[PDB]
């Protein structure tokens, strides 16, 4: 499928250029997010004034700086521990629905945690690393509790 680009999704592709993508992937990633669209060749002459010089005017203030010195300097153990017995086996991680859980409900939704692992998912017991959001693009790290008190 030929599509016109709207977002920075290609290293040789630019706003208002035509690229060929498989339709199942275009309908999964590009079209519903307003990042590239079918046809649209008749509208591109306005994209520079309507989008390019609009996004670049926000990128003149957001953030106009490099690196943070708040909430981000530390490393310590957190109140989060892993559920496992004396065989040391986890039997597959339930991740975002168990890692911060305190009630283990069955009639209602268990709230999805916003934490991020450096390895994506947990697999084994012991002293693993986890992180949480401290700003719109910035995450702070901690290690899990193994004393289980």
């Amino acid at each position: 499928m030929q599509v016109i680009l709207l977002d920075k999704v290609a290293n040789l592709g630019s706003l208002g250029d035509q690229v060929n993508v498989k339709a199942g992937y275009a309908r999964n990633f590009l079209v519903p997010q307003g990042k590239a669209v079918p046809a649209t060749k008749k509208n591109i002459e306005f994209f520079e004034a309507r989008r390019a010089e609009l996004e670049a005017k926000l990128a003149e203030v957001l953030a106009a700086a490099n690196a943070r010195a708040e909430k981000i300097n530390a490393l310590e153990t957190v109140t989060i521990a892993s559920k496992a017995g004396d065989e040391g086996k986890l039997f597959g991680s339930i991740g975002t629905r168990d890692i911060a859980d305190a009630v283990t409900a069955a009639g209602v939704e268990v709230a999805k945690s916003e934490v991020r692992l450096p390895n994506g998912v947990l697999r084994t017991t012991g002293e693993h690393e986890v992180s949480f959001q401290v700003h719109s693009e910035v995450f702070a790290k901690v290690i899990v509790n193994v004393v289980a008190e």
Binding site: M1, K22, A23, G24, R27
Partner: protein
């Protein structure tokens, strides 16, 4: 029978010619794989047998309409 179940491919008779010209048979036959769909009107990964270039038509018709065409031709899947 190898069926693509959306682009009309079926096992059918025909010629093969390039230059000679010899009576060599072709019998037009496609490639055959399977894909797993999700429709969220039932909690299953729905498996269907398929061939090349069918997903562009499963998008253009919608999966409901593609399974409705199989019933309209009496074709089991």
């Amino acid at each position: 029978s190898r069926v693509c179940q959306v682009t009309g491919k079926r096992p059918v008779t025909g010629n093969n010619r390039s230059h000679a010209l010899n009576a060599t048979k072709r019998r037009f036959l496609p490639n055959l794989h399977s894909h797993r769909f999700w429709v969220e009107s039932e909690k299953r990964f729905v498996t269907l047998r398929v061939s090349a270039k069918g997903m562009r038509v499963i998008d253009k018709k919608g999966i409901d309409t593609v399974l409705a065409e199989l019933r309209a031709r009496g074709e089991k899947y």
